Amino acid sequence: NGFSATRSTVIQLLNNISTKREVEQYLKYFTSVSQQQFAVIKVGGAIISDNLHELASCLAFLYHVGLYPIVLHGTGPQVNGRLEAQGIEPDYIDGIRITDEHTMAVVRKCFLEQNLKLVTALEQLGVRARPITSGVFTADYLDKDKYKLVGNIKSVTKEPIEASIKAGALPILTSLAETASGQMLNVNADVAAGELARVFEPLKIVYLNEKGGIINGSTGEKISMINLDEEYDDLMKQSWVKYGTKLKIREIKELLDYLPRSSSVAIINVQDLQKELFTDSGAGTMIRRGY
Template identity: 45%
Template sequence: MGSAGPACNRGRAIPPHRGNRRGARLVTEVRPIVVELLGQLGSSREARQYLEQFSRVNESRFAVVKVGGGVLAEDLDHLVGALAFLHRLGLYPIVMHGAGPQLDRALAEAGIETLKRDGLRVTSEEVMAIARPVIYRENARLVDALERHGVRARGLLHGVFECDFADREKLGLVGEVADVHLEPVRGAVAAGALPVVACLGESRSGQVMNINADIATRELVWAIKPYKIIFLTPTGGLLDESGRIISAISLTNDYEGLMAQSWVHSGMQLKLAQIREMLDPLPPSASVSITSAEKLTRELFTHTGAGTLVRKGEQIEWYEQVPDDRRAELEALLEAAFDRKLRPDWLDGRPVRGLLMAESGRAAALILEGADGVPYLDKIVVTPEARGEGLGAALWQVLRARAPAMYWRARINNPIAGWYFQQAEASHRRGQWVVYTIGIEDFAQMERLVKDAAARDSGWREEAE
């Protein structure tokens, strides 16, 4: 058993931008930086794979990174370090920032009450008189910090968002985005500078308006259609009922269930609803990564990521047997992933318990009847195109729900052995194999499962792998 990528693979495939000016420069200049990256992450294969993906994307479409005001206040050093690192790699994330906590504090100091309606800050002229300098100051703080790190940055305070009044009587000077002008963003990137966009807009007549940072980010994402969408927060992800970070959420499969949970508070419900609305018009492979500034690099350059990956998602379908109309698709998926050929009779006599397969055909897990009736995971595969999307994580979650106890094997030199060790409760070396188990407590039974796994037929034309 093995995989073309770990089950928690997390990047949406976008065709290469043929006019990309970074390509040749990356090849010649990036090696020392990659070495530094590998020292941080410990995986050359993953880092190089993601760097190749990112380098094929149009410069202004690499990523939109939404930075909360709390991150600017509490974690500026990590944020600037991560953005500077990406800039050295020749990558230009578009930074969209808020300043909510800073504005709350400034209003309190001025004796002005903070009012919100429908989750939006009521912005009177009195509030705007304080909000503008606060937002200007936070934008300048980030730009200055980047430039102190040797990174060219350009603050974009105006000229990106053209607005109408959302509801002047109810909300005051709050803007509803009517159009997004990308020329300032593209101009910054063309000049080699990171665009740092403030959440302010203007009407056609020049009236400055306040825009909710999450809404501004949504509109920017819809206009740019970036390869990566990242939200940086102090918590580093969405938290479950025990305060632990949820690694992956598929809106297709998990949204309704999550929204019904008593521990999902109103703020988390709003965030999930906003992300769902943002992803709705985008391709099925679209996703949002919620992580911390400190772990931004790990989120971008590793399969496992470091936060919550919220995917638009697709259905993971369950079959009691390998259906005739999907057998050829499954075999092509396995052979392409492993670069090997299956024997024509590989499925004959295999006691299939079930097949999990993504509706797109980009991920699958074949489960067999195992020793003592325990499910045996025979094959699991995620295509290279799906790596970075979280499709594998969704597959693994469905698999675990169907098989609370199971076992599988992988070669000792399997490139995702580290991930298998993280998922398994026990592992056992048997010659060239490592056998992994979950949900097995009886040692005698465990030994039977290990012996069974090590002796199983792989199904490949050549047994030597």
């Protein structure tokens, strides 16, 4: 809601504008009376460890121009770092972490740390943020025998996210879910973000990763656009598509079958976020249902 452009906000806004067209684009967003949620942004765990300042800076820009994102982040790399320090190797199937009781302890502790890290970086920039670490995702077991403490999300409770935004604070969420009776269950961040998007139907849906999209492994070329109805089935049969990419793309396809056809998902690097959000950039991989 609250628009308050600091010196850094003004510089961020102007520094890459070069045309009337770009100016007009920003004017359209700043004069908008829409009540639609602006954005759900999924943040790769690696970005919080490697690229915190940059992440905090673009989130701060959005905050200062009154366009609050719902932010959901992962924690995969730092979990593997802790397990390795303890002489334990991680285990996945279908891109999903097999999560026994000891692994869940590490996952929970790492999520809390990395969540607070991001919230604090934001507060150090004068951006109000709330760590939302429980009470959003209710889940049952995806498959206890196979994955152990891994959740299948059944419902999203919106009130803590909306209360945060209403209070003027960015809601910063982990992908942890809970059963009704309170057993925490690990969920993949790509999946949890998609559930948020499903229920909020935001203007913008963004997945931030380091590669800045999805890279065709046979050619090495970045895939600019994916038309799911045409390309999904045979894209998934390609042997270069890694488990994590397969999980990501499956979730997005399911998400976009629910959302209206006007919705889309951008998979992009954080340095290209502003131009993709505001000035209609072709950076990253854009994914839509299509025909």
